[PDB]
Amino acid sequence: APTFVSVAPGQTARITCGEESLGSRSVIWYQQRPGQAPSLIIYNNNDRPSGIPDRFSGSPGSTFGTTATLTITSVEAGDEADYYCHIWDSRRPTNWVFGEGTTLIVLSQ
Amino acid sequence: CASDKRNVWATHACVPTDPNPQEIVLENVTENFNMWKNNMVEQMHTDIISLWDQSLKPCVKLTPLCVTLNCTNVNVTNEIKNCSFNITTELRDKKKKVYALFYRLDVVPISNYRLINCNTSAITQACPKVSFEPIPIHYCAPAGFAILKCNDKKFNGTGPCKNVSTVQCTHGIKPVVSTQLLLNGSLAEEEIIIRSENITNNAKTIIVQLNESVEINCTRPNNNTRKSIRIGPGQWFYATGDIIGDIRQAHCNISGTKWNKTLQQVVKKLREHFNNKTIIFNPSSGGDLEITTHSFNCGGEFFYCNTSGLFNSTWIGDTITLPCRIKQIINMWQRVGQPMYAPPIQGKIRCVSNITGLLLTRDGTETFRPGGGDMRDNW
Amino acid sequence: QSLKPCVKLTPLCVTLNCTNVNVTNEIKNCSFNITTELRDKKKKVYALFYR
Amino acid sequence: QVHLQESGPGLVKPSETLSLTCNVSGTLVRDNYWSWIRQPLGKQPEWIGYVHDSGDTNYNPSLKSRVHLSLDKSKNLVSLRLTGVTAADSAIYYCATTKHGRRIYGVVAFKEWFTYFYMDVWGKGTSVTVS
Ligand SMILES: *[C@@H]1O[C@H](CO)[C@@H](O[C@@H]2O[C@H](CO)[C@@H](O[C@@H]3O[C@H](CO[C@H]4O[C@H](CO[C@H]5O[C@H](CO)[C@@H](O)[C@H](O)[C@@H]5O)[C@@H](O)[C@H](O[C@H]5O[C@H](CO)[C@@H](O)[C@H](O)[C@@H]5O)[C@@H]4O)[C@@H](O)[C@H](O[C@H]4O[C@H](CO)[C@@H](O)[C@H](O)[C@@H]4O[C@H]4O[C@H](CO)[C@@H](O)[C@H](O)[C@@H]4O[C@H]4O[C@H](CO)[C@@H](O)[C@H](O)[C@@H]4O)[C@@H]3O)[C@H](O)[C@H]2NC(C)=O)[C@H](O)[C@H]1NC(C)=O
Ligand SMILES: *[C@@H]1O[C@H](CO)[C@@H](O[C@@H]2O[C@H](CO)[C@@H](O[C@@H]3O[C@H](CO[C@H]4O[C@H](CO)[C@@H](O)[C@H](O)[C@@H]4O)[C@@H](O)[C@H](O[C@H]4O[C@H](CO)[C@@H](O)[C@H](O)[C@@H]4O[C@H]4O[C@H](CO)[C@@H](O)[C@H](O)[C@@H]4O)[C@@H]3O)[C@H](O)[C@H]2NC(C)=O)[C@H](O)[C@H]1NC(C)=O
Ligand SMILES: *[C@@H]1O[C@H](CO)[C@@H](O[C@@H]2O[C@H](CO)[C@@H](O[C@@H]3O[C@H](CO[C@H]4O[C@H](CO)[C@@H](O)[C@H](O)[C@@H]4O)[C@@H](O)[C@H](O[C@H]4O[C@H](CO)[C@@H](O)[C@H](O[C@H]5O[C@H](CO)[C@@H](O)[C@H](O)[C@@H]5O)[C@@H]4O)[C@@H]3O)[C@H](O)[C@H]2NC(C)=O)[C@H](O)[C@H]1NC(C)=O
Ligand SMILES: *[C@@H]1O[C@H](CO)[C@@H](O[C@@H]2O[C@H](CO)[C@@H](O)[C@H](O)[C@H]2NC(C)=O)[C@H](O)[C@H]1NC(C)=O
Ligand SMILES: *[C@@H]1O[C@H](CO)[C@@H](O[C@@H]2O[C@H](CO)[C@@H](O)[C@H](O)[C@H]2NC(C)=O)[C@H](O)[C@H]1NC(C)=O
Ligand SMILES: *[C@@H]1O[C@H](CO)[C@@H](O[C@@H]2O[C@H](CO)[C@@H](O)[C@H](O)[C@H]2NC(C)=O)[C@H](O)[C@H]1NC(C)=O
Ligand SMILES: *[C@@H]1O[C@H](CO)[C@@H](O[C@@H]2O[C@H](CO)[C@@H](O)[C@H](O)[C@H]2NC(C)=O)[C@H](O)[C@H]1NC(C)=O
Ligand SMILES: *[C@@H]1O[C@H](CO)[C@@H](O[C@@H]2O[C@H](CO)[C@@H](O)[C@H](O)[C@H]2NC(C)=O)[C@H](O)[C@H]1NC(C)=O
Ligand SMILES: *[C@@H]1O[C@H](CO)[C@@H](O[C@@H]2O[C@H](CO)[C@@H](O)[C@H](O)[C@H]2NC(C)=O)[C@H](O)[C@H]1NC(C)=O
Ligand SMILES: *[C@@H]1O[C@H](CO)[C@@H](O[C@@H]2O[C@H](CO)[C@@H](O)[C@H](O)[C@H]2NC(C)=O)[C@H](O)[C@H]1NC(C)=O
Ligand SMILES: *[C@@H]1O[C@H](CO)[C@@H](O[C@@H]2O[C@H](CO)[C@@H](O)[C@H](O)[C@H]2NC(C)=O)[C@H](O)[C@H]1NC(C)=O
Ligand SMILES: *[C@@H]1O[C@H](CO)[C@@H](O[C@@H]2O[C@H](CO)[C@@H](O)[C@H](O)[C@H]2NC(C)=O)[C@H](O)[C@H]1NC(C)=O
Ligand SMILES: *[C@@H]1O[C@H](CO)[C@@H](O[C@@H]2O[C@H](CO)[C@@H](O)[C@H](O)[C@H]2NC(C)=O)[C@H](O)[C@H]1NC(C)=O
Ligand SMILES: *[C@@H]1O[C@H](CO)[C@@H](O)[C@H](O)[C@H]1NC(C)=O
Ligand SMILES: *[C@@H]1O[C@H](CO)[C@@H](O)[C@H](O)[C@H]1NC(C)=O
Ligand SMILES: *[C@@H]1O[C@H](CO)[C@@H](O)[C@H](O)[C@H]1NC(C)=O
Ligand SMILES: *[C@@H]1O[C@H](CO)[C@@H](O)[C@H](O)[C@H]1NC(C)=O
Ligand SMILES: *[C@@H]1O[C@H](CO)[C@@H](O)[C@H](O)[C@H]1NC(C)=O
């Protein structure tokens, strides 16, 4: 089920989700540290909650025919976490299951 | 006629106009006019029907599509159906399964559905290169005849005109097709003019000519894709393919304050024919969609807008948004048995029209409802 | 001119199954297959024809 | 700071009712939306349903007849009652607060919008095995 990426610390990671966008979307991104509950990184495509740095941003929900994208710049060792992605879409039925995640492997520990 | 590609209203059966038409004022001439007995109206109505019918002759019949459709809503929304069906290809011994989107108003239930007119007549698709955008048509007199024009600013439609001029021909008249509201016509110069054959009857319509326009902004927000399906040997059918983006409802926007000023003025002048009674405006009473809604051709698509948001008020001593429906199979000029299929137009559609008048009818406090689908009242 | 604006019977040029089961103890009772308004559907119908 | 503590039996028998409790502190139960989430080991998490006051409650259709969510205003507790547990329910369960907002794409008068939900505050969760 999972996808893997491997990024050296200081490099940019690219994580994607799901199927192609059909209509307007609101993508919610979560970060899960092994052994811990997941937490929210981004809601509404690009609105991050307080405590989340500007290194986390993603694709707009205004486009169609594309996939969800999370960009993590300047990846730190502290970003070695799995990533989950919950997609809301105006044409698809409500998704009750978060999509399959992508594990971010951070090098040179 | 006289006039000035492949527009449906430009079949070139008629001559070009004179770049500098003449008008001669006839001094001291009083002439009795009666717009309700005018035979130029019958002449125009007949010519308009013919231009339309001639234009639809040289193109594809959709008789081959009268097959059972399998229609679902599997991938459109979380009024538009996704239908699969079998068609022939250019070879008579071969068939293939195809998909198309159809609007609910064009499809009726009976392998579940049928096109709405397959038990009545053959459906001709509009020839795809033909534009429906109106072109002004001038009507000009033959030898031995003359056209007289009435220049009285307050002329309602009947009786003597004290300022009469002779013209070689009429101004250009745009063959705009609409129902409840008259679009893109001429404005009155001094005041709103309310005119009817008999203002005290119920069987007669009232044409209200405004001296100010009200803009109506209409749109079709869905990004439709046109798909081309081969039905026969050089015969293509144009189907709606997938919708890109959100599924949204078509609509029209009328400013709230302009509409209200317009009604204050219409009512003020209506109380000059009726006693000082309460005047109420209601939505039309019912019947066919072509009567109950405001229909028009915008960008080539056929809209049916709900005007209950306009004609809903009581008169005594923001933006209005009207939802609209879109149809592809239509029956113009109330002719039963001669349906036409309008191919989908790719991309988004927007048009801005001018409301220049209203068509009102009295119900049996006075009650007025919008309406009248008889095109002669527009002309 | 009068016969132009109406129905052709080309679709009836099909094989007919004609009998005399219920007419007399010159008119035949014929059954045949025709299409309906849908091009993918056919039905069996009956009609009387003169010999 | 909202803290969500969780407990449960740890071990539940098959074809039995599982009841998990989320102890809410730092906020009141009556003032927010609550969600239950579960994560089978090795899998992406599933949103069970959400519960709130005013009847604004909904459930994952696969659990439509198996899950009852409720809020105890007096004890300020959030809880899950899952009935008829099976091997597929052997997951870590989490309690979380929920926030929501509206995505508008068209005319609001025609309801061309939708409500989306997200979970900001998560508890530690509790591991449940169905034997
Ligand atoms: C007839 O008249 C009627 C009525 O007048 C017309 O109806 C209108 O039709 C239009 C479109 O047809 C609708 O437009 C959409 O509106 C929504 C809502 O925006 C309004 O509300 C915003 C704030 O509300 C939200 O946040 C507050 C915060 O508290 C919250 O309380 C509230 O509940 C709600 O959640 C305002 O900010 C916004 O104003 C902003 O935009 C204005 C645009 O012109 C600008 O002038 C202002 O100065 C200001 O900047 C407005 O008041 C819009 O969100 C929506 O636009 C988004 O979605 C479309 C479709 O997907 C997309 O194309 C757009 O690009 C945009 O998507 C971006 O923003 C999303 C916000 O969540 C984000 O989620 C997306 O991922 C994406 O984000 C990316 O770009 C942004 C750019 O800023 C960037 O910041 C991000 O980081 C990222 O890069 C449309 O504009 C009208 O709502 C509708 N009106 C009504 C009343 O229905 C009708 O069209 C007329 N018909 C005719 C024929 O004329
Ligand atoms: C795909 O399509 C489906 C089906 O249309 C859609 O699911 C529906 O989503 C809507 C929107 O979230 C849900 O509507 C809410 O319903 C609750 C009550 O519903 C329950 O009770 C009814 C009773 O018959 C049951 O039928 C139903 O099944 C449920 O059991 C309402 O309380 C909600 O109202 C609040 O939210 C609205 C906006 O979402 C506000 O406009 C409204 O004012 C209310 O908010 C206010 O009050 C809140 C509580 O006091 C407060 O917290 C807020 O801050 C605010 O003050 C709302 O009507 C609907 O139930 C869903 N299910 C069904 C079967 O319709 C999917 O969402 C859609 N998915 C996508 C991605 O488009
Ligand atoms: C009342 O009076 C009003 C004012 O006259 C009318 O509103 C006007 O209505 C007309 C017709 O609907 C609108 O004109 C259309 O505008 C479209 C958009 O043009 C814009 O973008 C263009 C991009 O290139 C740009 O060049 C324009 O300057 C403008 O910015 C046009 O696309 C459309 O073109 C049509 O006619 C062309 C003639 O050559 C033809 O080539 C076009 O072909 C395109 O589309 C077809 C569709 O199948 C494709 O197959 C082709 O490959 C190609 O893509 C197309 O057929 C046309 O110019 C006008 O804009 C609008 N005015 C306003 C203010 O909006 C009202 O409608 C009248 N009321 C009533 C009831 O009639
Ligand atoms: C009678 O009608 C004629 C025709 O419309 C009016 O003549 C026009 O007057 C305007 C005023 O500037 C001129 O610009 C036009 O060029 C004139 N038209 C022609 C054909 O000459 C005339 O003014 C009207 N008379 C009255 C008393 O209303
Ligand atoms: C009409 O379309 C529906 C679309 O759902 C067909 O129903 C099922 O569609 C799914 C799509 O993957 C198939 O896997 C199923 O096998 C279909 N059902 C059956 C019984 O085969 C439906 O069959 C279609 N009917 C016709 C006459 O085309
Ligand atoms: C052809 O089929 C259409 C659609 O079924 C028939 O139209 C319906 O006719 C009934 C008659 O009472 C009306 O009540 C329905 O409202 C009509 N439906 C629609 C969509 O308008 C039509 O009458 C049939 N024609 C023939 C000759 O049988
Ligand atoms: C349009 O104006 C004409 C001319 O004034 C009106 O015609 C008169 O109507 C009254 C009604 O009682 C008659 O008594 C007059 O004899 C009519 N005059 C002529 C010359 O026929 C006409 O009624 C007005 N139209 C409307 C709708 O009010
Ligand atoms: C809709 O009404 C507006 C005015 O409210 C028209 O715009 C102007 O009309 C005058 C008429 O003499 C022209 O001289 C102006 O040049 C027009 N304005 C512009 C910017 O050209 C508008 O043309 C009307 N639309 C229709 C379809 O009649
Ligand atoms: C205009 O309409 C009015 C109202 O229908 C006509 O007046 C009616 O004429 C009939 C004739 O049989 C009388 O029975 C009604 O009692 C009259 N009604 C009223 C209110 O008087 C009027 O004659 C029509 N005028 C024209 C020129 O057609
Ligand atoms: C409606 O959809 C079409 C098709 O997606 C958009 O037109 C372009 O289509 C080409 C086909 O390769 C793409 O490469 C372009 O990128 C599309 N345009 C854009 C801006 O991305 C069309 O633009 C859409 N219409 C609207 C109004 O968005
Ligand atoms: C219909 O569309 C027209 C033009 O697209 C709108 O006219 C504009 O209105 C804004 C309002 O602030 C003005 O600032 C612009 O200068 C106007 N443009 C022009 C060319 O005049 C009109 O308001 C729209 N009508 C509705 C009901 O929304
Ligand atoms: C135009 O829209 C109005 C509402 O915006 C429609 O009126 C509703 O019709 C339904 C049909 O049963 C009634 O149940 C509602 O109570 C009506 N609403 C109101 C406010 O009375 C109207 O039918 C639509 N007309 C057309 C021609 O589509
Ligand atoms: C005409 O407008 C009035 C209000 O201006 C509409 O009255 C509403 O009727 C509905 C019926 O269920 C009520 O629920 C609303 O609360 C009423 N609104 C107000 C402000 O009282 C009336 O329905 C409109 N008529 C049509 C046909 O749409
Ligand atoms: C098209 O023809 C095939 C032939 O078997 C049939 O199975 C299929 O159902 C037909 N499609 C429709 C929509 O009738
Ligand atoms: C379509 O066919 C199915 C077959 O069971 C039937 O259940 C359904 O009601 C039909 N729908 C229509 C519009 O006839
Ligand atoms: C239209 O008629 C009304 C009637 O009073 C008048 O007040 C208004 O100024 C007139 N508008 C124009 C453009 O003459
Ligand atoms: C239109 O005029 C009426 C008069 O009673 C008023 O009540 C209504 O609010 C006005 N509408 C607008 C858009 O001002
Ligand atoms: C009509 O078609 C059926 C299809 O099997 C056939 O059996 C029947 O004989 C045909 N009827 C006639 C009169 O040919």
**Torsion over CA: B8, B12, B13, B19 (sign):** positive
Contacts of D112 in chain B (CB under 8 A): 246, 248-249
> Would strands B107-109 and C17-19 be described as parallel, antiparallel, or unpaired?
unpaired
- How far is it, in rounded angstroms, from Cα B257 to Cα B162? 37
Q: Residue B144: which region, alpha, beta or left (left: phi > 0; alpha: psi -120 to 50)?
A: left
Domains of chain A: 3-106 (2.60.40.10)
- How far is it, in rounded angstroms, from Cα C32 to Cα B368? 57
Look at residue D41 and give its three-state secondary structure: coil
- How far is it, in rounded angstroms, from Cα B106 to Cα D92? 52
Which residue bears the tokens 């970060």?
A31
Select from C6, C7, C38 the residue whose CB has the most chain B CBs within 10 Å, as the one to mutate to test that interface.
C38
Let me know: does D56 contact D119? Beta carbons within 8 Å.
no
Domains of chain D: 3-130 (2.60.40.10)
Q: Show the 3-state SS of A62-107.
A: CCCCCCEEEEECCCCHHHCCEEEEEEEECCCCCCCECEEEEEEEEC
- How far is it, in rounded angstroms, from Cα B228 to Cα B237? 6
Buried b (16+ CB within 10 A) or exposed e, B189-199: eeebbbbbbee
Amino acid C46 reads Y
Select from B63, B65, B66, B231 the residue whose CB has the most chain C CBs within 10 Å, as the one to mutate to test that interface.
B66
Query: For residue A13, what are the CA distances in angstroms to A3, A39, A75, A78, B213?
Result: 13, 18, 7, 13, 58
Q: How was this structure determined?
A: cryo-EM
Let me know: does B324 contact B251? Beta carbons within 8 Å.
yes
Let me know: does D21 contact D7? Beta carbons within 8 Å.
yes
CB contact under 8 A, B66 and C38: yes
For chain B, the 3-state helix, strand and coil shares in percent, each to the nearest 5, are 10, 40, 45
Q: Which strand (E) or helix (H) includes residue B329?
A: strand B329-330
- How far is it, in rounded angstroms, from Cα B32 to Cα B7? 37
Q: What angle do CA D5, D10, D14 make, to 5 degrees?
A: 130
Residue spans of beta strands (DSSP E) within B132-171: 147-150, 158-161, 164-167
- How far is it, in rounded angstroms, from Cα A31 to Cα A29? 7
Written as one string, the DSSP assignment of D65-108 is TTEEEEEETTTTEEEEEEES--GGG-EEEEEEEEEEEEEE-S-G
Residues 96-115 of D with CB under 8 A from A: 96, 99, 101, 103, 105, 114
**Torsion over CA: B103, B104, B107, B112 (sign):** positive
- How far is it, in rounded angstroms, from Cα D22 to Cα D8? 9
Q: Which residues contact D71 (CB under 8 A, 6 or more apart)?
A: D29, D30, D34, D51, D52, D53, D77, D78, D79
* Structure token digits, residue A77: 């060792």
CA-nearest of B125, B135, B124 to B5 is B135
Q: What is the resolution of this structure in A?
A: 3.1
CB contact under 8 A, C40 and B119: no
Q: What angle do CA B285, B290, B294 make, to 5 degrees?
A: 80
Which residue bears the tokens 């250019």?
B90
Number of H helices, E strands in chain B: 3, 28
